[PDB]
Design a protein around this nucleic acid. Structure first.
Length: 10
DNA sequence: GAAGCTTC
DNA sequence: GAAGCTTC
């Protein structure tokens, strides 16, 4: 996720 | 190193 | 199935 906690997506 | 997910 | 980057 995020970053942090990529995206989604990318 | 180890956890934090939908979108093509 | 690849398609992704960091907090910690």
């Amino acid at each position: 996720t995020x970053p942090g906690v990529t995206x989604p997506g990318v």
